[PDB]
Amino acid sequence: WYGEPSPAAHWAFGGKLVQITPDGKGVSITNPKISGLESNTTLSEALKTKDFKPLINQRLVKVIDDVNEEDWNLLEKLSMDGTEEFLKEALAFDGNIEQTISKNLVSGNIKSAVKNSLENDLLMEAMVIALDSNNERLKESVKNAYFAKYGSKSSLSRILYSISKREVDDLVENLDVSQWKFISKAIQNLYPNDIAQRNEMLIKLGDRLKENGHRQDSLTLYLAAGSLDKVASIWLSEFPDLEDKLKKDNKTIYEAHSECLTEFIERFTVFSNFINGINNEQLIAKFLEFINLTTSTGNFELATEFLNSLPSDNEEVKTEKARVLIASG
Protein backbone atom coordinates (compact mmCIF):
# COMPACT_ATOMS: atom_id res chain seq x y z
CA TRP A 1 0.00 0.00 0.00
CA TYR A 2 2.18 2.87 1.32
CA GLY A 3 5.92 3.59 1.45
CA GLU A 4 8.04 1.55 -0.96
CA PRO A 5 11.44 1.96 -2.72
CA SER A 6 11.02 3.79 -6.04
CA PRO A 7 13.21 5.94 -8.37
CA ALA A 8 10.14 8.21 -8.82
CA ALA A 9 11.67 9.89 -11.87
CA HIS A 10 10.60 13.39 -12.94
CA TRP A 11 11.45 15.07 -16.25
CA ALA A 12 12.57 18.71 -16.00
CA PHE A 13 13.41 21.78 -18.09
CA GLY A 14 16.62 21.29 -20.11
CA GLY A 15 16.32 17.55 -20.71
CA LYS A 16 17.10 16.92 -17.04
CA LEU A 17 15.86 13.73 -15.42
CA VAL A 18 15.66 13.75 -11.63
CA GLN A 19 15.49 10.39 -9.82
CA ILE A 20 16.05 8.76 -6.42
CA THR A 21 19.21 6.62 -6.14
CA PRO A 22 18.86 2.83 -5.52
CA ASP A 23 19.91 3.17 -1.87
CA GLY A 24 16.77 5.29 -1.50
CA LYS A 25 18.56 8.17 0.24
CA GLY A 26 20.16 10.30 -2.51
CA VAL A 27 19.17 12.21 -5.66
CA SER A 28 20.41 11.53 -9.20
CA ILE A 29 20.09 14.29 -11.82
CA THR A 30 21.24 13.20 -15.29
CA ASN A 31 20.98 14.34 -18.93
CA PRO A 32 19.60 11.30 -20.84
CA LYS A 33 20.64 11.17 -24.50
CA ILE A 34 17.37 10.61 -26.36
CA SER A 35 17.35 8.62 -29.62
CA GLY A 36 16.45 10.85 -32.59
CA LEU A 37 16.78 13.90 -30.35
CA GLU A 38 20.26 15.42 -30.63
CA SER A 39 21.84 18.77 -29.78
CA ASN A 40 22.24 20.52 -33.14
CA THR A 41 26.05 20.45 -33.42
CA THR A 42 26.23 21.64 -37.05
CA LEU A 43 23.88 24.61 -36.56
CA SER A 44 25.44 25.90 -33.32
CA GLU A 45 28.80 25.67 -35.11
CA ALA A 46 27.49 27.40 -38.25
CA LEU A 47 26.04 30.19 -36.08
CA LYS A 48 29.37 30.97 -34.36
CA THR A 49 31.97 30.28 -37.10
CA LYS A 50 29.52 31.69 -39.70
CA ASP A 51 30.34 28.60 -41.77
CA PHE A 52 27.11 27.28 -43.31
CA LYS A 53 28.98 25.01 -45.77
CA PRO A 54 28.70 21.71 -43.80
CA LEU A 55 24.99 22.35 -43.11
CA ILE A 56 24.37 22.67 -46.88
CA ASN A 57 25.93 19.23 -47.42
CA GLN A 58 23.53 17.78 -44.84
CA ARG A 59 20.31 19.36 -46.14
CA LEU A 60 21.23 18.77 -49.82
CA VAL A 61 21.03 15.01 -49.20
CA LYS A 62 18.11 15.36 -46.75
CA VAL A 63 16.09 16.93 -49.60
CA ILE A 64 12.31 16.34 -49.61
CA ASP A 65 10.47 17.72 -52.68
CA ASP A 66 11.20 19.82 -55.81
CA VAL A 67 10.36 23.20 -54.24
CA ASN A 68 12.61 22.46 -51.25
CA GLU A 69 15.49 21.44 -53.54
CA GLU A 70 15.34 24.76 -55.42
CA ASP A 71 15.69 26.68 -52.14
CA TRP A 72 18.74 24.73 -50.95
CA ASN A 73 20.40 24.79 -54.40
CA LEU A 74 19.87 28.56 -54.25
CA LEU A 75 21.54 28.75 -50.82
CA GLU A 76 24.61 26.87 -52.10
CA LYS A 77 24.93 29.40 -54.95
CA LEU A 78 24.50 32.21 -52.42
CA SER A 79 27.25 30.67 -50.25
CA MET A 80 29.97 30.05 -52.86
CA ASP A 81 29.50 33.11 -55.11
CA GLY A 82 28.27 35.82 -52.73
CA THR A 83 24.91 37.55 -52.28
CA GLU A 84 25.78 40.57 -54.49
CA GLU A 85 27.12 38.41 -57.34
CA PHE A 86 24.03 36.16 -57.54
CA LEU A 87 21.61 39.12 -57.81
CA LYS A 88 23.56 40.43 -60.81
CA GLU A 89 23.23 36.93 -62.31
CA ALA A 90 19.49 36.44 -61.69
CA LEU A 91 18.34 39.93 -62.75
CA ALA A 92 20.33 39.96 -66.01
CA PHE A 93 18.87 39.66 -69.52
CA ASP A 94 19.94 37.30 -72.34
CA GLY A 95 7.50 41.59 -81.19
CA ASN A 96 11.08 41.14 -79.93
CA ILE A 97 12.17 44.42 -81.60
CA GLU A 98 9.70 46.45 -79.53
CA GLN A 99 11.19 44.58 -76.53
CA THR A 100 14.79 45.39 -77.58
CA ILE A 101 14.10 49.13 -77.33
CA SER A 102 12.74 48.49 -73.81
CA LYS A 103 16.05 46.74 -72.96
CA ASN A 104 18.11 49.71 -74.18
CA LEU A 105 16.17 52.32 -72.20
CA VAL A 106 16.28 50.63 -68.78
CA SER A 107 19.97 49.78 -69.28
CA GLY A 108 20.76 53.47 -69.92
CA ASN A 109 21.80 52.91 -73.54
CA ILE A 110 19.73 55.67 -75.17
CA LYS A 111 22.03 55.65 -78.22
CA SER A 112 21.00 52.20 -79.51
CA ALA A 113 17.33 52.80 -78.60
CA VAL A 114 16.94 55.69 -81.06
CA LYS A 115 18.47 53.84 -84.03
CA ASN A 116 16.47 50.66 -83.33
CA SER A 117 13.16 52.57 -83.23
CA LEU A 118 13.83 54.48 -86.46
CA GLU A 119 15.02 51.31 -88.25
CA ASN A 120 11.60 49.81 -87.49
CA ASP A 121 9.43 52.81 -88.45
CA LEU A 122 8.60 53.81 -84.84
CA LEU A 123 8.99 57.59 -85.17
CA MET A 124 6.69 58.66 -82.30
CA GLU A 125 8.61 56.60 -79.74
CA ALA A 126 11.92 57.59 -81.34
CA MET A 127 11.01 61.20 -80.54
CA VAL A 128 9.88 60.63 -76.94
CA ILE A 129 13.28 59.09 -76.22
CA ALA A 130 15.16 61.97 -77.89
CA LEU A 131 13.11 64.68 -76.16
CA ASP A 132 14.78 63.98 -72.79
CA SER A 133 18.29 63.20 -74.09
CA ASN A 134 19.99 66.62 -74.23
CA ASN A 135 22.74 64.75 -76.10
CA GLU A 136 22.40 66.10 -79.67
CA ARG A 137 23.70 64.29 -82.81
CA LEU A 138 20.87 61.77 -82.30
CA LYS A 139 18.34 64.62 -82.02
CA GLU A 140 19.52 65.48 -85.54
CA SER A 141 19.01 61.87 -86.71
CA VAL A 142 15.41 61.66 -85.47
CA LYS A 143 14.63 64.88 -87.37
CA ASN A 144 16.23 63.64 -90.62
CA ALA A 145 13.98 60.56 -90.48
CA TYR A 146 10.88 62.72 -89.95
CA PHE A 147 11.84 64.81 -92.99
CA ALA A 148 12.58 61.55 -94.84
CA LYS A 149 8.86 60.68 -94.53
CA TYR A 150 6.79 63.88 -94.20
CA GLY A 151 9.39 66.45 -95.31
CA SER A 152 8.48 68.50 -98.37
CA LYS A 153 4.71 67.84 -98.26
CA SER A 154 2.56 70.72 -96.94
CA SER A 155 3.75 74.28 -96.18
CA LEU A 156 4.07 73.84 -92.38
CA SER A 157 6.35 70.81 -92.82
CA ARG A 158 8.60 72.85 -95.13
CA ILE A 159 8.83 75.62 -92.51
CA LEU A 160 9.86 73.02 -89.87
CA TYR A 161 12.67 71.81 -92.15
CA SER A 162 13.96 75.39 -92.58
CA ILE A 163 13.97 75.99 -88.81
CA SER A 164 15.51 72.62 -87.85
CA LYS A 165 18.35 72.49 -90.41
CA ARG A 166 18.57 76.31 -90.46
CA GLU A 167 18.61 76.49 -94.29
CA VAL A 168 16.07 78.64 -96.17
CA ASP A 169 17.31 77.85 -99.70
CA ASP A 170 14.61 75.20 -100.12
CA LEU A 171 11.91 77.41 -98.54
CA VAL A 172 12.79 80.28 -100.90
CA GLU A 173 12.65 77.89 -103.84
CA ASN A 174 9.75 75.52 -103.11
CA LEU A 175 7.14 77.10 -100.80
CA ASP A 176 3.78 78.66 -101.74
CA VAL A 177 4.82 82.07 -103.09
CA SER A 178 1.92 83.95 -101.50
CA GLN A 179 3.43 82.85 -98.18
CA TRP A 180 6.38 85.12 -99.08
CA LYS A 181 6.09 87.05 -95.78
CA PHE A 182 6.86 83.86 -93.84
CA ILE A 183 9.97 83.47 -96.00
CA SER A 184 10.76 87.14 -95.20
CA LYS A 185 10.83 86.54 -91.42
CA ALA A 186 12.74 83.26 -91.82
CA ILE A 187 15.72 85.11 -93.36
CA GLN A 188 15.73 87.84 -90.69
CA ASN A 189 15.80 85.11 -88.02
CA LEU A 190 18.36 82.87 -89.75
CA TYR A 191 20.88 85.63 -90.47
CA PRO A 192 20.52 88.37 -87.85
CA ASN A 193 24.31 88.23 -88.03
CA ASP A 194 25.15 87.73 -91.73
CA ILE A 195 24.36 90.68 -94.05
CA ALA A 196 25.95 89.04 -97.13
CA GLN A 197 23.90 85.84 -96.92
CA ARG A 198 20.75 87.72 -95.86
CA ASN A 199 20.72 89.81 -99.04
CA GLU A 200 21.43 86.90 -101.41
CA MET A 201 18.33 85.08 -100.11
CA LEU A 202 16.06 88.15 -100.07
CA ILE A 203 17.20 88.70 -103.68
CA LYS A 204 16.60 85.01 -104.49
CA LEU A 205 13.05 85.35 -103.13
CA GLY A 206 12.68 88.74 -104.85
CA ASP A 207 13.77 87.24 -108.18
CA ARG A 208 11.17 84.55 -107.58
CA LEU A 209 8.35 87.00 -106.83
CA LYS A 210 9.21 88.73 -110.14
CA GLU A 211 9.21 85.39 -112.01
CA ASN A 212 5.72 84.72 -110.61
CA GLY A 213 4.09 88.14 -111.10
CA HIS A 214 4.40 89.75 -107.66
CA ARG A 215 6.02 92.97 -108.96
CA GLN A 216 4.96 95.22 -106.07
CA ASP A 217 5.91 92.55 -103.51
CA SER A 218 9.28 91.97 -105.26
CA LEU A 219 10.39 95.61 -105.03
CA THR A 220 9.68 95.47 -101.27
CA LEU A 221 12.31 92.72 -100.96
CA TYR A 222 14.71 94.49 -103.33
CA LEU A 223 14.47 97.58 -101.11
CA ALA A 224 14.97 95.34 -98.06
CA ALA A 225 18.12 93.77 -99.53
CA GLY A 226 19.55 97.13 -100.68
CA SER A 227 19.97 96.41 -104.39
CA LEU A 228 19.47 99.05 -107.11
CA ASP A 229 20.52 96.63 -109.87
CA LYS A 230 17.31 94.60 -109.67
CA VAL A 231 14.86 97.53 -109.26
CA ALA A 232 16.62 99.26 -112.17
CA SER A 233 16.24 96.07 -114.23
CA ILE A 234 12.52 95.99 -113.30
CA TRP A 235 12.08 99.60 -114.48
CA LEU A 236 14.27 99.28 -117.60
CA SER A 237 12.16 96.38 -118.90
CA GLU A 238 9.06 98.56 -118.42
CA PHE A 239 10.74 101.49 -120.21
CA PRO A 240 9.75 101.03 -123.91
CA ASP A 241 6.13 100.30 -122.93
CA LEU A 242 5.89 103.41 -120.72
CA GLU A 243 7.51 105.39 -123.54
CA ASP A 244 4.99 104.16 -126.13
CA LYS A 245 2.09 105.25 -123.88
CA LEU A 246 3.14 108.92 -123.86
CA LYS A 247 3.19 108.78 -127.68
CA LYS A 248 -0.51 107.82 -127.46
CA ASP A 249 -1.04 110.60 -124.89
CA ASN A 250 -0.92 113.24 -127.65
CA LYS A 251 2.85 113.93 -127.61
CA THR A 252 5.57 114.13 -130.30
CA ILE A 253 8.35 111.54 -130.71
CA TYR A 254 10.72 113.93 -128.89
CA GLU A 255 8.32 114.99 -126.10
CA ALA A 256 7.73 111.27 -125.48
CA HIS A 257 11.47 110.51 -125.31
CA SER A 258 12.22 113.69 -123.33
CA GLU A 259 9.49 113.05 -120.77
CA CYS A 260 10.06 109.30 -120.36
CA LEU A 261 13.72 109.97 -119.56
CA THR A 262 13.01 112.85 -117.17
CA GLU A 263 10.38 110.80 -115.27
CA PHE A 264 12.39 107.56 -115.09
CA ILE A 265 15.51 109.44 -113.93
CA GLU A 266 13.52 111.51 -111.42
CA ARG A 267 11.97 108.33 -109.97
CA PHE A 268 15.24 106.35 -109.92
CA THR A 269 16.96 109.18 -108.02
CA VAL A 270 14.23 109.58 -105.37
CA PHE A 271 14.26 105.80 -104.77
CA SER A 272 18.09 105.86 -104.80
CA ASN A 273 18.04 107.99 -101.63
CA PHE A 274 16.16 105.54 -99.36
CA ILE A 275 18.36 102.52 -100.16
CA ASN A 276 21.82 101.33 -99.06
CA GLY A 277 24.42 100.73 -101.79
CA ILE A 278 25.77 100.45 -110.12
CA ASN A 279 27.26 98.74 -113.20
CA ASN A 280 24.11 97.90 -115.21
CA GLU A 281 25.01 98.72 -118.84
CA GLN A 282 21.42 99.65 -119.77
CA LEU A 283 21.18 101.93 -116.72
CA ILE A 284 24.49 103.67 -117.53
CA ALA A 285 23.29 104.26 -121.11
CA LYS A 286 19.96 105.79 -120.01
CA PHE A 287 21.82 108.06 -117.58
CA LEU A 288 24.07 109.10 -120.50
CA GLU A 289 21.05 109.93 -122.71
CA PHE A 290 19.85 112.20 -119.88
CA ILE A 291 23.34 113.77 -119.55
CA ASN A 292 23.09 115.09 -123.13
CA LEU A 293 19.56 116.36 -122.40
CA THR A 294 20.50 118.24 -119.20
CA THR A 295 23.59 119.86 -120.74
CA SER A 296 21.55 121.07 -123.73
CA THR A 297 19.33 122.92 -121.25
CA GLY A 298 22.43 124.80 -120.01
CA ASN A 299 22.41 123.18 -116.56
CA PHE A 300 25.98 121.82 -116.26
CA GLU A 301 25.81 121.64 -112.45
CA LEU A 302 23.11 118.93 -112.45
CA ALA A 303 24.82 117.02 -115.29
CA THR A 304 28.14 116.79 -113.41
CA GLU A 305 26.33 115.34 -110.37
CA PHE A 306 24.89 112.59 -112.59
CA LEU A 307 28.23 111.86 -114.28
CA ASN A 308 29.90 111.24 -110.89
CA SER A 309 27.23 108.70 -109.87
CA LEU A 310 28.47 106.43 -112.68
CA PRO A 311 31.69 104.39 -112.43
CA SER A 312 34.59 106.06 -114.27
CA ASP A 313 35.80 102.95 -116.13
CA ASN A 314 34.01 103.78 -119.39
CA GLU A 315 35.69 106.00 -122.00
CA GLU A 316 32.43 107.77 -122.97
CA VAL A 317 31.67 108.66 -119.34
CA LYS A 318 35.29 109.81 -118.93
CA THR A 319 35.05 111.95 -122.09
CA GLU A 320 31.61 113.30 -121.10
CA LYS A 321 32.96 114.26 -117.67
CA ALA A 322 35.83 116.05 -119.46
CA ARG A 323 33.47 117.79 -121.91
CA VAL A 324 31.24 119.40 -119.27
CA LEU A 325 34.36 120.05 -117.17
CA ILE A 326 35.85 122.51 -119.69
CA ALA A 327 32.40 123.61 -120.96
CA SER A 328 31.22 125.20 -117.70
CA GLY A 329 34.61 126.65 -116.69
Binding site: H10, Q19, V27, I29
Partner: protein, 279 residues
Protein backbone atom coordinates in the same frame (compact mmCIF):
# COMPACT_ATOMS: atom_id res chain seq x y z
CA UNK B 1 25.21 15.26 -10.54
CA UNK B 2 24.58 13.13 -7.43
CA UNK B 3 23.49 14.46 -4.03
CA UNK B 4 24.19 11.44 -1.81
CA UNK B 5 22.63 11.00 1.66
CA UNK B 6 20.32 14.05 1.58
CA UNK B 7 17.96 12.29 4.00
CA UNK B 8 18.68 9.69 6.67
CA UNK B 9 15.43 7.86 5.83
CA UNK B 10 14.01 6.54 2.53
CA UNK B 11 13.15 9.37 0.11
CA UNK B 12 9.79 9.35 -1.71
CA UNK B 13 9.91 12.24 -4.23
CA UNK B 14 12.58 14.42 -5.84
CA UNK B 15 11.43 17.32 -8.03
CA UNK B 16 13.29 20.19 -9.70
CA UNK B 17 11.69 23.63 -10.11
CA UNK B 18 10.40 25.44 -13.22
CA UNK B 19 14.02 26.33 -14.14
CA UNK B 20 15.42 22.85 -13.39
CA UNK B 21 17.82 24.42 -10.88
CA UNK B 22 16.22 24.17 -7.42
CA UNK B 23 15.55 20.74 -5.88
CA UNK B 24 12.84 19.79 -3.37
CA UNK B 25 13.18 16.36 -1.70
CA UNK B 26 10.87 14.69 0.83
CA UNK B 27 11.03 11.54 2.99
CA UNK B 28 9.92 9.31 5.87
CA UNK B 29 11.71 11.72 8.23
CA UNK B 30 8.57 13.89 7.98
CA UNK B 31 10.62 16.71 6.39
CA UNK B 32 11.25 18.50 3.10
CA UNK B 33 14.74 19.60 2.07
CA UNK B 34 15.55 22.29 -0.51
CA UNK B 35 18.82 22.33 -2.46
CA UNK B 36 20.55 24.80 -4.78
CA UNK B 37 22.07 23.00 -7.79
CA UNK B 38 24.82 24.33 -10.07
CA UNK B 39 27.57 22.22 -11.69
CA UNK B 40 28.35 19.08 -9.72
CA UNK B 41 27.70 20.96 -6.46
CA UNK B 42 24.75 21.26 -4.08
CA UNK B 43 23.78 23.37 -1.05
CA UNK B 44 21.19 22.60 1.63
CA UNK B 45 19.05 25.75 1.85
CA UNK B 46 16.60 24.59 4.54
CA UNK B 47 14.83 21.64 6.15
CA UNK B 48 11.07 22.28 6.27
CA UNK B 49 9.23 20.79 9.26
CA UNK B 50 5.54 20.44 10.15
CA UNK B 51 4.33 17.13 8.72
CA UNK B 52 3.25 14.61 11.37
CA UNK B 53 4.08 11.67 9.09
CA UNK B 54 5.85 10.40 5.93
CA UNK B 55 5.93 13.03 3.14
CA UNK B 56 4.81 11.46 -0.15
CA UNK B 57 5.10 14.15 -2.84
CA UNK B 58 5.97 17.79 -3.56
CA UNK B 59 5.22 20.14 -6.47
CA UNK B 60 6.74 23.46 -7.47
CA UNK B 61 4.49 26.35 -8.39
CA UNK B 62 5.11 28.73 -11.28
CA UNK B 63 7.60 31.59 -10.54
CA UNK B 64 4.94 34.28 -11.19
CA UNK B 65 3.14 33.52 -7.92
CA UNK B 66 6.46 33.41 -6.06
CA UNK B 67 8.75 30.63 -4.85
CA UNK B 68 5.99 28.37 -3.52
CA UNK B 69 6.03 24.62 -2.87
CA UNK B 70 3.14 22.30 -1.96
CA UNK B 71 3.75 19.03 -0.08
CA UNK B 72 1.48 16.17 0.99
CA UNK B 73 1.65 13.52 3.71
CA UNK B 74 0.25 10.38 5.30
CA UNK B 75 -0.86 12.75 8.10
CA UNK B 76 -3.60 13.86 5.67
CA UNK B 77 -2.56 17.52 5.49
CA UNK B 78 -1.33 19.61 2.60
CA UNK B 79 1.14 22.29 3.70
CA UNK B 80 2.15 25.21 1.48
CA UNK B 81 5.64 26.77 1.71
CA UNK B 82 7.30 29.99 0.47
CA UNK B 83 10.75 31.54 0.16
CA UNK B 84 10.37 35.24 0.96
CA UNK B 85 13.13 37.52 2.31
CA UNK B 86 15.55 34.56 2.18
CA UNK B 87 13.53 32.54 4.72
CA UNK B 88 11.28 29.50 4.25
CA UNK B 89 8.02 29.25 6.20
CA UNK B 90 4.65 27.49 6.14
CA UNK B 91 2.03 29.97 4.89
CA UNK B 92 -1.11 27.84 4.31
CA UNK B 93 -2.56 24.52 5.52
CA UNK B 94 -5.14 22.37 3.71
CA UNK B 95 -6.56 19.71 6.09
CA UNK B 96 -9.78 18.47 4.48
CA UNK B 97 -9.02 14.79 3.82
CA UNK B 98 -9.48 12.20 6.57
CA UNK B 99 -6.77 9.94 5.15
CA UNK B 100 -3.28 9.96 3.59
CA UNK B 101 -2.86 12.56 0.85
CA UNK B 102 -1.00 10.86 -2.01
CA UNK B 103 -0.70 13.42 -4.84
CA UNK B 104 -0.24 17.17 -5.10
CA UNK B 105 0.09 19.31 -8.24
CA UNK B 106 -0.16 22.99 -9.21
CA UNK B 107 -2.39 23.59 -12.23
CA UNK B 108 -1.20 25.42 -15.36
CA UNK B 109 -0.38 29.04 -14.41
CA UNK B 110 -3.19 30.07 -16.77
CA UNK B 111 -5.71 28.83 -14.16
CA UNK B 112 -3.98 30.57 -11.23
CA UNK B 113 -2.67 29.24 -7.88
CA UNK B 114 -4.84 26.08 -7.99
CA UNK B 115 -3.85 22.83 -6.29
CA UNK B 116 -4.97 19.36 -7.43
CA UNK B 117 -5.11 17.10 -4.36
CA UNK B 118 -5.57 13.28 -4.23
CA UNK B 119 -6.38 11.28 -1.05
CA UNK B 120 -6.90 7.74 0.30
CA UNK B 121 -10.36 8.80 1.47
CA UNK B 122 -11.70 8.66 -2.10
CA UNK B 123 -11.82 12.44 -2.42
CA UNK B 124 -10.10 14.73 -4.88
CA UNK B 125 -9.96 18.37 -3.83
CA UNK B 126 -9.14 21.46 -5.88
CA UNK B 127 -7.83 24.49 -3.97
CA UNK B 128 -7.33 28.02 -5.21
CA UNK B 129 -5.19 29.85 -2.68
CA UNK B 130 -6.87 33.26 -2.70
CA UNK B 131 -4.80 36.39 -2.15
CA UNK B 132 -7.16 37.52 0.63
CA UNK B 133 -6.10 34.61 2.89
CA UNK B 134 -9.15 32.33 3.02
CA UNK B 135 -9.99 29.49 0.59
CA UNK B 136 -13.08 27.75 -0.86
CA UNK B 137 -12.01 24.21 -1.90
CA UNK B 138 -13.95 22.03 -4.34
CA UNK B 139 -14.26 18.42 -3.11
CA UNK B 140 -15.55 15.41 -5.07
CA UNK B 141 -16.00 11.67 -4.60
CA UNK B 142 -13.68 10.20 -7.22
CA UNK B 143 -12.55 6.70 -6.30
CA UNK B 144 -13.56 3.61 -4.34
CA UNK B 145 -11.01 2.61 -1.64
CA UNK B 146 -8.78 5.63 -2.43
CA UNK B 147 -7.09 8.02 -4.86
CA UNK B 148 -3.35 7.68 -5.45
CA UNK B 149 -2.65 10.07 -8.34
CA UNK B 150 -4.15 13.23 -9.89
CA UNK B 151 -2.65 15.06 -12.92
CA UNK B 152 -3.65 18.21 -14.79
CA UNK B 153 -4.17 18.30 -18.55
CA UNK B 154 -2.43 21.09 -20.50
CA UNK B 155 -4.12 24.51 -20.71
CA UNK B 156 -6.53 24.48 -23.71
CA UNK B 157 -11.69 23.41 -20.92
CA UNK B 158 -10.18 22.57 -17.52
CA UNK B 159 -9.51 18.83 -17.30
CA UNK B 160 -7.56 16.45 -15.08
CA UNK B 161 -7.02 12.68 -14.80
CA UNK B 162 -7.11 10.44 -11.70
CA UNK B 163 -5.66 7.00 -10.88
CA UNK B 164 -7.31 4.97 -8.11
CA UNK B 165 -7.36 1.99 -5.77
CA UNK B 166 -10.41 0.73 -7.71
CA UNK B 167 -8.14 -0.02 -10.72
CA UNK B 168 -9.74 2.82 -12.68
CA UNK B 169 -8.39 5.83 -14.57
CA UNK B 170 -10.84 8.78 -14.67
CA UNK B 171 -11.07 11.99 -16.73
CA UNK B 172 -12.75 15.01 -15.09
CA UNK B 173 -13.84 18.33 -16.64
CA UNK B 174 -15.10 21.59 -15.09
CA UNK B 175 -18.72 22.66 -15.59
CA UNK B 176 -20.21 26.12 -15.02
CA UNK B 177 -23.73 24.93 -14.09
CA UNK B 178 -22.53 22.16 -11.73
CA UNK B 179 -19.95 24.53 -10.13
CA UNK B 180 -17.55 21.57 -10.01
CA UNK B 181 -15.65 18.88 -11.91
CA UNK B 182 -17.77 16.18 -13.61
CA UNK B 183 -16.70 12.76 -14.91
CA UNK B 184 -15.99 12.85 -18.65
CA UNK B 185 -14.73 9.25 -18.93
CA UNK B 186 -13.93 6.11 -16.98
CA UNK B 187 -11.03 4.24 -18.61
CA UNK B 188 -10.87 0.53 -17.79
CA UNK B 189 -7.75 -1.59 -18.28
CA UNK B 190 -5.60 -2.03 -15.17
CA UNK B 191 -6.25 -5.00 -12.86
CA UNK B 192 -4.78 -3.58 -9.62
CA UNK B 193 -4.28 -0.27 -7.72
CA UNK B 194 -3.41 2.53 -10.13
CA UNK B 195 -0.32 4.27 -8.71
CA UNK B 196 0.38 7.18 -11.05
CA UNK B 197 -1.27 9.07 -13.90
CA UNK B 198 0.33 11.70 -16.13
CA UNK B 199 -1.03 13.96 -18.90
CA UNK B 200 1.61 14.91 -21.51
CA UNK B 201 2.01 18.71 -22.00
CA UNK B 202 2.33 18.00 -25.75
CA UNK B 203 0.45 20.84 -27.48
CA UNK B 204 -0.05 18.61 -30.57
CA UNK B 205 -3.28 17.37 -32.20
CA UNK B 206 -3.28 14.27 -29.96
CA UNK B 207 -3.52 13.79 -26.18
CA UNK B 208 -1.30 11.38 -24.26
CA UNK B 209 -1.98 9.75 -20.89
CA UNK B 210 0.41 7.57 -18.90
CA UNK B 211 -1.21 5.38 -16.26
CA UNK B 212 1.07 3.19 -14.17
CA UNK B 213 -0.10 0.31 -11.91
CA UNK B 214 0.40 -2.36 -9.23
CA UNK B 215 -0.62 -4.77 -12.02
CA UNK B 216 2.92 -4.28 -13.44
CA UNK B 217 1.59 -2.73 -16.66
CA UNK B 218 1.65 0.77 -18.09
CA UNK B 219 -1.08 2.06 -20.37
CA UNK B 220 -0.86 5.02 -22.72
CA UNK B 221 -4.34 6.43 -23.38
CA UNK B 222 -4.57 8.55 -26.53
CA UNK B 223 -7.28 10.86 -27.87
CA UNK B 224 -7.35 12.30 -31.41
CA UNK B 225 -9.90 15.11 -30.88
CA UNK B 226 -12.26 16.70 -28.30
CA UNK B 227 -15.01 14.19 -27.39
CA UNK B 228 -14.57 10.81 -29.13
CA UNK B 229 -12.87 7.62 -27.98
CA UNK B 230 -9.88 7.10 -25.70
CA UNK B 231 -7.66 4.43 -27.25
CA UNK B 232 -5.98 1.84 -25.07
CA UNK B 233 -2.32 1.16 -25.83
CA UNK B 234 -0.24 -1.21 -23.72
CA UNK B 235 3.34 0.14 -23.48
CA UNK B 236 4.87 -3.36 -23.79
CA UNK B 237 3.02 -6.69 -24.07
CA UNK B 238 4.87 -8.61 -21.32
CA UNK B 239 4.35 -7.53 -17.70
CA UNK B 240 7.12 -5.63 -15.90
CA UNK B 241 9.40 -7.37 -13.34
CA UNK B 242 7.94 -5.29 -10.50
CA UNK B 243 5.11 -2.89 -9.53
CA UNK B 244 5.21 0.34 -11.54
CA UNK B 245 5.05 3.45 -9.37
CA UNK B 246 5.60 6.56 -11.47
CA UNK B 247 5.22 8.00 -14.96
CA UNK B 248 6.54 11.33 -16.22
CA UNK B 249 6.42 13.16 -19.54
CA UNK B 250 9.21 15.29 -21.05
CA UNK B 251 8.65 19.01 -21.63
CA UNK B 252 8.78 18.49 -25.39
CA UNK B 253 9.29 15.29 -27.36
CA UNK B 254 6.60 13.17 -25.72
CA UNK B 255 9.11 10.89 -23.95
CA UNK B 256 8.25 8.67 -20.97
CA UNK B 257 9.99 8.43 -17.60
CA UNK B 258 8.69 5.22 -16.01
CA UNK B 259 9.73 4.22 -12.49
CA UNK B 260 9.43 0.56 -11.46
CA UNK B 261 9.70 -1.37 -8.18
CA UNK B 262 12.88 -3.04 -9.46
CA UNK B 263 14.51 0.40 -9.09
CA UNK B 264 15.10 0.69 -12.84
CA UNK B 265 13.98 3.76 -14.81
CA UNK B 266 12.98 3.13 -18.42
CA UNK B 267 12.61 5.81 -21.09
CA UNK B 268 10.16 5.19 -23.94
CA UNK B 269 9.18 6.78 -27.27
CA UNK B 270 6.47 6.13 -29.89
CA UNK B 271 7.18 4.71 -33.37
CA UNK B 272 5.53 4.68 -36.82
CA UNK B 273 2.94 2.01 -35.97
CA UNK B 274 1.89 3.76 -32.75
CA UNK B 275 3.85 1.19 -30.76
CA UNK B 276 6.38 1.96 -28.04
CA UNK B 277 10.12 1.30 -27.82
CA UNK B 278 13.07 2.38 -25.59
CA UNK B 279 14.64 5.84 -25.98
Amino acid sequence: VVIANAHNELIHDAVLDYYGKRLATCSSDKTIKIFEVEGETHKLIDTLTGHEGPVWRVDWAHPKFGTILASCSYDGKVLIWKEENGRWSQIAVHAVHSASVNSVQWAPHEYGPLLLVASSDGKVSVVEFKENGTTSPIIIDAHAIGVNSASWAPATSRKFVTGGADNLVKIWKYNSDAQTYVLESTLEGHSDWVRDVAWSPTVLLRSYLASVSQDRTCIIWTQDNEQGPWKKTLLKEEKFPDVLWRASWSLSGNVLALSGGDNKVTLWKENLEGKWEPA
